[PDB]
């Protein structure tokens, strides 16, 4: 279900995750793309100033609610380097956004954390469709698994 065009946007997400890591934040990047294929909004994690809710997917949900009609929201796609946490999946569904494509699943992330002896997140790694049963979800992208493993290990595996 991941197309060539989808993978290009996922690579952009990975670049945004890398920007976040390099700035002292956590490696999570996300991009909102409308049905015409225009990038509307890009963001990355910004938790370093002490708000652990500063996730890019959440920013995208609020931005979409403020700037896009319901119909435009439903036809838009959200690309992300890492599958929406429950906070972000719920926000996405509350505002009525459409498709999600992720590079790595929360299952991947949680599995790596336990491999590395790292503490589990404070929030359960629920798949998007546990939280938001109606959302169309594609991913993960096999081509990006190694990159994201390495990027998460840098932040969370030390």
The answer to whether 88 contacts Zn ion (rule: CB under 5 A) is yes
Least separation in angstroms between residue 156's CB and its own copies is 15
The answer to whether 87 contacts Zn ion (rule: CB under 5 A) is yes
The answer to whether 61 contacts its own copies (rule: CB under 8 A) is yes
Query: Which of 56, 59, 102 lies closest to 77, judged by CA?
Result: 102
The interface partner of residue 56, options being its own copies, Zn ion, none and the CB cut-off 5 to 8 Å by kind, is none
Q: Are 130 and 93 in contact (CB under 8 A)?
A: no
Site for Zn ion (CB under 5 A): which residue of 68, 85, 93, 141?
85
Pairing of strands 99-104, 77-82: parallel
The interface partner of residue 132, options being Zn ion, its own copies, none and the CB cut-off 5 to 8 Å by kind, is its own copies
Site for its own copies (CB under 8 A): which residue of 2, 95, 118, 145?
95
Q: Are 15 and 22 in contact (CB under 8 A)?
A: no
CA pair distance 78, 81, nearest whole angstrom: 10
Q: Are 156 and 118 in contact (CB under 8 A)?
A: yes
Q: Contact positions toward its own copies, by CB under 8 A? A: 50-53, 61-62, 65-66, 85-87, 89-91, 93-96, 122-124, 126, 130-134
């Amino acid at each position: 279900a991941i197309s060539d065009a989808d993978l290009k946007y996922l690579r952009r997400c990975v670049d945004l995750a890398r920007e976040a890591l390099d700035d002292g934040d956590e490696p999570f990047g996300s991009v909102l793309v409308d049905h015409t294929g225009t990038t509307l909004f890009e963001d990355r994690n910004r938790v370093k100033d002490g708000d652990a809710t500063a996730h890019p997917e959440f920013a995208i949900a609020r931005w979409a609610a403020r700037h896009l009609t319901p119909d435009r929201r439903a036809r838009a796609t959200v690309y992300t380097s890492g599958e929406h946490c429950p906070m972000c999946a719920a926000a996405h569904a509350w505002v009525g956004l459409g498709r999600i494509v992720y590079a790595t699943s929360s299952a991947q992330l949680g599995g790596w954390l336990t491999e590395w002896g790292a503490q589990a997140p404070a929030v359960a790694t629920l798949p998007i469709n546990t939280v938001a049963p109606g959302v169309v979800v594609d991913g993960p992208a096999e081509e990006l698994a190694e990159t994201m493993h390495n990027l998460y290990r840098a932040k969370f595996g030390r």
